[PDB]
Amino acid sequence: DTVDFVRNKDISGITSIKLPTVKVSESDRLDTGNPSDVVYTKDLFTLEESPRLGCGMMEMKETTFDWTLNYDEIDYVIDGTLDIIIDGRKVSASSGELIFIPKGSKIQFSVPDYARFIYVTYPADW
Amino acid sequence: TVDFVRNKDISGITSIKLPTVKVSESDRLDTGNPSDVVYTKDLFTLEESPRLGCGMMEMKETTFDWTLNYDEIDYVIDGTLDIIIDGRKVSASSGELIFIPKGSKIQFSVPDYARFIYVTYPADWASQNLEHHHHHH
Ligand SMILES: [Mg+2]
């Protein structure tokens, strides 16, 4: 396969992914503008594979950063704790919980310790 | 009011404690076969989430036919979900993911049991039909 994780990509495009085999690396580092931030985003589907829904793996360690979303997002927290700071308020999810974030939200992704989560977005392509 | 634990912020940003999401008979999908056991519980109204649909699905000892004229991502929490497409099988168990592109004619096949989150586009997946509604009038 041409990816570095384990999947079964069927002829039809239907795909299973063994998510524990998805490992982030430095090519997935997100530039927040602050080089000390440690944030990884690893898209799991090309646009050709999934033209409408985006889906990837995000990991953060001891980092809080500002970001504005151009898309709707569902985050399913696999491990750790993710805090979302919005307008001075906090919304949090730990392992096995989810967060929905509407398009246009001006947030901080805030991870005092560690978090690993799937993100599903719409649209995949701006 | 909903029957699960969530924090719905003023901004629309919402956390959900998914283990508190319990399916009930109000969520039972009538497949046509009375012995089938399928539950679908949407977790967001259209006003809450106008583009992404998201809910909890459970199945037990059931396989049924479905055509998805919408895209779907499933995260399998417990059990095993099989997707049968053109005589082939794609499977995900606890901790694994499935993507189903729009236009897929499948069987959802759960000979054992499965509990999974689904995320769809468009949001109102159950109205992606000629009737524009969840049930035929
Ligand atoms: Mg064929």
| Domain coordinates in residue numbering, chain A | 1-126
List the determination method: X-ray
CA pair distance A45, B125, nearest whole angstrom: 21
Residues of A in contact with B97 (CB under 8 A): 16-17, 19, 44, 55, 118
Q: Is the dihedral of CA B132, A100, B29, B81 positive or negative?
A: positive
Residue B37 burial (C-beta neighbours within 10 Å; 0-12, 13-18, 19+):
middle
Q: Which of B75, B86, B91 sits opposite A12 (nearest CB)?
A: B86
Contact call for residues A72 and A36 (beta carbons, < 8 A) = no
Beta bridge partners, A16, equal A8, B98
B99 in contact with chain A, both atoms CB, cutoff 8 A: yes
3-state secondary structure of B25: helix
Quickly list DSSP for A1-47: --SSS-EEE-TTS-EEE-GGG----GGGB---S-TT--EEEEE-S-T
CA pair distance B72, B100, nearest whole angstrom: 5
CA pair distance B45, A5, nearest whole angstrom: 35
Query: Which CATH number applies to A1-126: 3.40.50.1860, 2.60.120.10, 1.10.1200.10, 3.10.450.40?
Result: 2.60.120.10
CATH code for residues B1-137: 2.60.120.10
Give the pair of three-digit tokens for residue A116: 């690993």
Q: Which of A20, A86, A122 sits opposite B95 (nearest CB)?
A: A20
Q: Which alpha helices (DSSP H) does A62-117 contain, by range?
A: none
A31 in contact with chain B, both atoms CB, cutoff 8 A: no
Write phi, then psi, for B4 (nearest 5 degrees): -135, 170
Q: How many residues does chain A have?
A: 126
The amino acid sitting at B95 is G
Nearest CA in chain B to A93: B15
A1 in contact with chain B, both atoms CB, cutoff 8 A: no
3-state secondary structure of B125: helix
Q: Which of B44, B97, B104 sits opposite A12 (nearest CB)?
A: B104
The helices-and-strands tally (H runs, E runs) of chain A is: 0, 8
Q: Is the peptide bond before A123 cis (omega within 30 degrees of 0)?
A: yes
